[PDB]
Amino acid sequence: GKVKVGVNGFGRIGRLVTRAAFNSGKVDIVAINDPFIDLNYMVYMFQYDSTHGKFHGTVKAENGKLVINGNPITIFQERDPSKIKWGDAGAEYVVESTGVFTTMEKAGAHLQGGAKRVIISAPSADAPMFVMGVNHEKYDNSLKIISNASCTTNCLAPLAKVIHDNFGIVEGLMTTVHAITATQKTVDGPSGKLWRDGRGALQNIIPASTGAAKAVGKVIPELNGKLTGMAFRVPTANVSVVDLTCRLEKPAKYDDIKKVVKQASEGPLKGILGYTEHQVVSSDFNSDTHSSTFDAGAGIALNDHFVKLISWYDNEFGYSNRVVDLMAHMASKE
């Protein structure tokens, strides 16, 4: 019943997606492709994680196949995506997580190998974007290549949708305090395009830009041209926070905002948007599957039309779980 999924690239996103798929069980992984990691290294990388701890289960290599919880997984080492025999392994959906094939033309090479549909775990210039709980009902099954946007967009979209539906956002600017990523340098190093990104990650705030706020307009058409922002990269490990400053049409006291956010988090957006009133910190959301958790006590309102909202999100676990959920919904809609 569950759809067969193949993963391209065994980086951070690919490993986390495999972990989420095996933890939730909504889909079955049957093939992985990576031209620079061998089988034993794959076992070592999957077994041990610095951020999320040891894998809860059994992983081993046998007969040239990665066996996780007794499920053999075919391993490929092709560099050209058009040469990967996805159909032979039985994979129906393919997750493109390498981060280098983001356009529709580049990502469509996987279709030649026998895959039916391709999901891009990154923003795409021309592929359609879907965010779970916001516009995933727009999927009609006639699209072969889509996109899951990014972690920041997935965190910002549900809260922005609720706020716009209840009070009518007029314009907003977003600032996100982000954790370090794999593109940063351990010590001040060489950067070709972004000079700031080449500086030492352990001792530099390194202010950075981001197009997630713009992409929210793509996900929600009514908010097109009304959002934008930047980002800061602090020397933390896993958890990021989003800060949204927006102007509302209708008057909205902070208690009303809290009530509507809690109501949305309970019924319609259960498991996607969280709500908390405790004195939480960043480490309290490690390995949390929510796309975004609204922090009631951290926000502040200048008046009835000018507020600042704070939302937490795990940029590793939440995005992978959202990718798995999107694949499951796509399989159900088939």
Add this chain to the structure above:
Amino acid sequence: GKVKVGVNGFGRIGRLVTRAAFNSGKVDIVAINDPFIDLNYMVYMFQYDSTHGKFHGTVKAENGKLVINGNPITIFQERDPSKIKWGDAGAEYVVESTGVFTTMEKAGAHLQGGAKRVIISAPSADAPMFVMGVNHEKYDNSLKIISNASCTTNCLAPLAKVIHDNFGIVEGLMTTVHAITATQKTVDGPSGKLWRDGRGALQNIIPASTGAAKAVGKVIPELNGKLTGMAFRVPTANVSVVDLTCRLEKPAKYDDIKKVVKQASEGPLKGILGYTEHQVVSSDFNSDTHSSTFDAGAGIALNDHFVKLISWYDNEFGYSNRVVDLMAHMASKE
């Protein structure tokens, strides 16, 4: 000619103030009071600094007096401020930096010891607030107890003043990414009032509140009731950044904002407000004496009436240098 200054408390602020006074030479330190630090420990603490490096000069203890660059300094160990013989040591001005005597009544005990005026290096509930380059011309010499506000207020005030003068701020919300301070815990520890502040500083974002934006209204009367914000405490070492989101009356393209900020930084606010167009990071402002440096490339504008401005500031060196400058101006006005 230079006024004689006595320092109460040898914490971070007191040590940095002494260092700034000896580096610039605008004032002379002639007495220090601390009931928990002895002479040899004082020499050790002043000589070595983890953030700003070794002191450039000579410091030693002789005859029960701290000698810095050949200048003897009287040392007191009184716990009650009313019992300190400030007049005997020749100190005219006293810097109250312990952080526990912030009200006018509590801080006035130093006057009984023979001091002429008292400067509080922290926000005060009832003492007048002065920020160098913003409203320091309002000092009239008839005030015996004043205040220098805080680092965040000193960073926000000049940029806000320039923006209000040129374009008429209507309302703004501020977010500051702050470095760790002495009030935080090395590991998750016990906190009586602020539960979030008791969590581990090395692994927690610990969102925190701040009244610096409100205090800007006190410093600039026209902006009363139009500013507010919060703060985030990231596990960095020394440098903080301020993010201001505001709505303007007159239309203002980003180039016009940059031009006016540069013009202000050059002539009127020279040495107080900086300007840069390079790809700088947080560590590039270590040991910088400016109150705030405008980052042209980091900001973003949604439209002609909604912008986000970014300013850097060293929360240790800049505040101490501002305190020294305020004391020098007070002495000149005498």
Add this chain to the structure above:
Amino acid sequence: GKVKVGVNGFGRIGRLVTRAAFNSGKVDIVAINDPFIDLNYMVYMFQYDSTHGKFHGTVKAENGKLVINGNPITIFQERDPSKIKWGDAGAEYVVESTGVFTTMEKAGAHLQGGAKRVIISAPSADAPMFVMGVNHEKYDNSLKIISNASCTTNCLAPLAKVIHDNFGIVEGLMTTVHAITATQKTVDGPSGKLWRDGRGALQNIIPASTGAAKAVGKVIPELNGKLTGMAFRVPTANVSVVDLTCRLEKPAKYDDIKKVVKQASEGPLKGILGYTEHQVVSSDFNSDTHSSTFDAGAGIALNDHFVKLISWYDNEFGYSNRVVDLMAHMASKE
């Protein structure tokens, strides 16, 4: 059947001991004493942990009692240990974890309250020391006040015992790379006795001394006067590593050492001393209950009589689990 245990002090060690007792179920906690933490703060502190994550269970306050997994716990706020009514709450054993009552006379005040035996979770000047798996068979039930030494001693004792039994250690020097603790300063701060310990923990190696190696001689009488060492405090979070350099009597190739260590870890010291041959790092031992894990690949041997052995240990979870195990063994011996 399980003995009733009362905990004095709700610091890091006390909270971790309560967590270990509720996770393993070998003993039952029925009373906690802390004069500076109220009930709601206790619930907040127990529920959330930055290092070990959220508590797996339910914790709440009701009728002035802390309820964990449905088990009510009496709460005391006495400051004088002699005034705590341990007998009224039904507590038989008391764990003294405040770190200020370490002598037999000071720790014996708990006996006046009705407690039968007292266990000190820290080194004691005169109380007997017991390490699980090394000399815990020497407990004879006639002792009312004992000690569990420390984390470093608990890590060093089993490996040293095995090495001495198999090859006859002649003399050794130990170096431990330790994680930051609650006694360190978030930023360079004031230290009364240890000047080095007052420096900034996030940016300083802060070399420190330690008497754990000496205490190993107390635990193992044959090694008296043959061990000693120092420590380094690096800006990590939870996991520490011990490095032992020793000279052996009998010739011992590295393979023989590995074989004997593995054999000891399997049968006799199961669950106390671990063994691994993988390429592990410090974060791979987070929340590990072993007292020490031997790292086969990290060690090196100059010749047949001069070797360096490496052992990992979680200084928070392992010590608490050892305390619980010692209490269970004491109850069994009753």
Add this chain to the structure above:
Amino acid sequence: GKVKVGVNGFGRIGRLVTRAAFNSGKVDIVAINDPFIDLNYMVYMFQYDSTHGKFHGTVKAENGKLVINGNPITIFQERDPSKIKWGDAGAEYVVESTGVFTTMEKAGAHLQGGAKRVIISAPSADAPMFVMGVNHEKYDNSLKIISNASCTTNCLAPLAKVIHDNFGIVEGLMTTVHAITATQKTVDGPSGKLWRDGRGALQNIIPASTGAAKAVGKVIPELNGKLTGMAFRVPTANVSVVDLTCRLEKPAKYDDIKKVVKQASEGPLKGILGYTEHQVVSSDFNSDTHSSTFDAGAGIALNDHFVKLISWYDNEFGYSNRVVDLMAHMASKE
């Protein structure tokens, strides 16, 4: 009079070598080669440093030449070392700091371009090794390709030489607590050979091996086959520490060791080996030009024949200054 020096590669070592050469003035840099950094990026990278602060001087680009303090510097972008026109730029000595041409045959390609001698800033399999203050008198001018070993070897060699000369080391094992380097990963990443080195540098101790102790035997022939050790990589920034455990022939109390080390540091090894008795930490040696500083208070001695010695060293500034000093001595010997 000063020799003309050309630098191959503008990495960390090359930039630090250029900075040291311009700060001390013992040599003149007249050419730099890097195929992946352009002129403007070179100016940006040289001007700003996260660890050592802003460059004290003026650096700018004009007419395709890097101008530092008014001295133009020719810039090359060749990838093949044999095609670099070292002779045209007037460079006599060439510093090979890329880390990929370490053998004599590979490093000799620079001779075809017109260079007279080549200095390798890294360990070499077959090139002769020289350490300033230990065996640099063995240079006879007939060698065209040599080596400066490494930072760890440069720290260990002088102290080991003094100890062997005064007391006769029999055998020793070394452990070094090292800071993070450019070869580490910002977050757990892919490592081809060293699996441990691919783990997250900000949250992992990552135990590592090192051949510096072995190379000490090459530098000091009498100690061949008597030294070896390993290393630990902690999440610090710049400063490392060396721990040496050795057995001595003659009896040696700790006071005698301190006296001999101080005497050596004063006269013969002035500026190479330091001596301190203060309560220093790692950050106190930032931007220190000494090869190694002996920490009197941190060491410990079990008996008269078994001691542990502690030495600090800046692995960035000290090595670069030693390279400059070696080049100056080579020029003088010409």
